[PDB]
Structures are given as structure tokens and as C-alpha cells.
């Protein structure tokens, strides 16, 4: 397969390097990633200014470039100016840290894969669920094994797989639904040298999902969480009720 590999931690992250190398053992791998820290950038794109690319070195057989854009920008550039519009699979990661629940909306890792979904290209976002002690090779190894056991015809149009791999011992994997895991954010106030106050964003996690098949619960149990997600945010149930009340 012609695979495009990107991430949000920069082309110099161990997470993307390990992943790119392993996939190159049996696939035509191309790497187009950000040249800096792009975490928490969500699905932002660059349209007001020019985008720049730089050919870098990852390992022979692997064509790589760094860009001044976001993960989503990287996928757009890779598709049109690097891969001749021929991409069989996109893998964004391996991210250092989990991307579950509502946090996926501000996730740069997920955004890369989601841009692929928007372009209707099979895409996967993969994250190592332990920021403090990530396991990049383990997550990449899981992906290799997963590909040999996953039927992409079952991945609907415009859909991607958001994968979270537990750092410890993998007991297995489960197809999950996105949880409503979110945060009760708050700010710590401080004062600058020039007397102006500033704020640091902090927060306490909220894990109150009642369903057992949600992402974080599987990861918590030592299972890889695999959620099929797509760029369609319509709340169907709400729309149906709204249409019943308003004619």
C-alpha cells in the first residue's frame, strides 16, 4: 500500500519514526509531518498564508518532508504535491498520550487522520495511552498486526479509526464508541513581572459514561480501543425530535 504517515508532535518524534520504519518493511511509505509542536491544534488549517515544505531524512526507502503547517495541512500537501493523489492509507501518530472522549476535537493527531477521512481515504489515528510512559514501538507493533486482521471494506466512506493503545500489556482490542470523557477546566491566576495577571489552563477529568463500550473503559482494562469516527456532527436524535415538534 501507498501509506502516508503524519503526526502532531513533529517529524522528529520517536512516535512517528518507529511507525514509519515498521510500515516501510512491506509498504510504500511517505512521511509529511509538522516541523514543530502541534498538539491541541485541533483541525486547524493554513489558508491565510503560504505553506512551506522541507525534505528531511528518516531512513532510506522512506520519502519524508516536514512542513510549516498543521497535521491537516500535511495530509493535504502529501496528497496533492507528494503522492500524486494516490494514497491507500493514512496513519497519524504514534501520539504520546491518549486521545479519547471529547478531547478528540482538539487533537492534532486525530485531525490528521480526520482530514484523510474528509478526503475519503482510509485513515487511522493511533495514540499510546500513557503520556508519562509512552510505548511507541508497542503501539506501532500492534498496528502492524491489526492491519493483517482488519477488513478495510468495513470502514465506511469518510470514516477513520481512532485507536488508543494501552502502554502496559495488551490483553486484546475492542471496537468502541467515543465516550463523553471531558474536563472540568479551571485556571490558576498569576501575575507577570509587569504586574499583569495571566492564566494557566488546568482541569479535573470527568469520567461519567454509563455505557461499557466506550473508549476509555476499554483502555482502562488493558484493551486497545478502536473507534470508527467521521466528520459528521449532526445530533440525529435531537434533529428528529425537533422536526416532530416543529412540523
- Residues engaged in binding Ca ion (CB under 5 A): 8-9, 39, 95, 183, 185
List 120, 168, 190, 205, residue binding a second copy (CB under 8 A): 120
* Closest to 1 measured CA to CA, from 32, 30, 36: 30
3-state secondary structure 16-68: HHHHHHHHCCCCEEEEEEECCCCCCCCCCCCCCCCCCEEEEEEECCEEEEEEC
Q: Do 77 and 69 form a contact (C-beta atoms < 8 A)?
A: yes
The number of CA neighbours under 13 Å toward the Cβ of 143 is: 34
Distance set, CA 112 to CA 6, 93, 116, 177, 205 (Å):
7, 9, 7, 20, 25
* CA gap 231, 237 in Å, rounded: 17
List 109, 164, 176, 178, residue binding ligand VO4 (CB under 6 A): 109
- The answer to whether the annotation marks 8 as part of a ligand binding site is yes
Name 72's bridge partners: none
* Grid cell listed for 176: 468502541
Look at residue 183 and give the partner it binds from a second copy, ligand VO4, Ca ion, none, a contact being a CB closer than 5 to 8 Å depending on partner kind: Ca ion
- The answer to whether the annotation marks 73 as part of a ligand binding site is no
| Nearer to a second copy (CB atom), residue 66 or residue 92 | 92
Task: Scan residues 76-105 and list those touching ligand VO4 (CB under 6 A).
Answer: 95, 97, 99
List 18, 45, 119, 170, residue binding a second copy (CB under 8 A): 119
Binding to a second copy by residue 236, rule CB under 8 A? Answer: no
Minimum CB distance to ligand VO4, residue 25 (Å): 25
Binding to a second copy by residue 50, rule CB under 8 A? Answer: no
* Closest to 95 measured CA to CA, from 60, 56, 124: 124
Binding to a second copy by residue 86, rule CB under 8 A? Answer: yes
Look at residue 185 and give the partner it binds from a second copy, Ca ion, ligand VO4, none, a contact being a CB closer than 5 to 8 Å depending on partner kind: Ca ion
Binding to ligand VO4 by residue 13, rule CB under 6 A? Answer: no
Binding to a second copy by residue 232, rule CB under 8 A? Answer: no
- Three-state DSSP state, 70: coil
| Positions in the binding site for a second copy (CB under 8 A) | 84-86, 118-121, 151, 153-154, 157
* Residues in contact with ligand VO4 by the rule CB under 6 A: 8, 39-40, 95, 97, 99, 106-109
Amino acid at each position: 500500500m501507498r501509506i502516508l504517515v503524519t503526526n502532531d508532535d513533529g517529524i522528529q518524534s520517536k512516535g512517528i519514526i518507529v511507525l514509519a520504519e515498521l510500515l516501510s518493511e512491506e509498504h510504500e511509505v511517505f512521511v509529511v509531518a509538522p516541523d514543530k509542536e502541534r498538539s491541541a491544534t485541533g483541525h486547524s488549517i493554513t489558508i491565510h498564508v503560504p505553506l512551506w515544505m522541507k525534505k528531511v531524512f528518516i531512513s532510506e526507502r522512506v520519502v519524508a518532508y516536514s512542513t510549516t503547517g498543521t497535521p491537516a495541512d500535511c495530509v493535504k500537501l502529501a496528497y496533492n504535491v507528494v503522492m500524486d493523489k494516490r494514497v491507500d492509507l493514512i496513519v497519524s501518530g504514534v501520539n504520546r498520550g491518549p486521545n479519547m472522549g471529547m478531547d478528540i476535537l482538539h487533537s492534532g493527531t486525530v485531525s490528521g487522520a480526520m482530514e484523510g477521512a474528509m478526503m475519503n481515504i482510509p485513515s487511522i489515528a493511533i495514540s499510546s495511552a500513557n503520556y508519562e510512559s509512552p510505548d511507541f514501538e508497542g503501539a506501532a507493533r500492534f498496528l502492524i498486526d491489526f492491519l493483517k486482521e482488519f477488513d478495510f471494506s468495513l470502514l465506511d466512506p469518510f470514516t477513520m479509526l481512532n485507536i488508543n493503545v494501552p502502554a502496559g500489556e495488551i490483553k486484546g482490542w475492542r471496537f468502541t464508541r467515543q465516550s463523553r470523557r471531558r474536563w472540568n477546566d479551571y485556571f490558576e491566576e498569576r501575575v507577570s513581572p509587569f504586574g499583569e495577571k495571566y492564566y494557566w489552563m488546568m482541569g479535573e477529568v470527568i469520567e461519567d459514561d454509563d455505557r461499557d463500550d466506550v473508549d476509555y473503559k476499554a483502555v482502562r482494562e488493558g484493551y486497545v480501543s478502536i473507534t470508527p469516527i467521521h466528520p459528521f456532527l449532526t445530533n440525529e436524535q435531537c434533529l428528529k425530535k425537533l422536526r416532530e415538534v416543529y412540523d
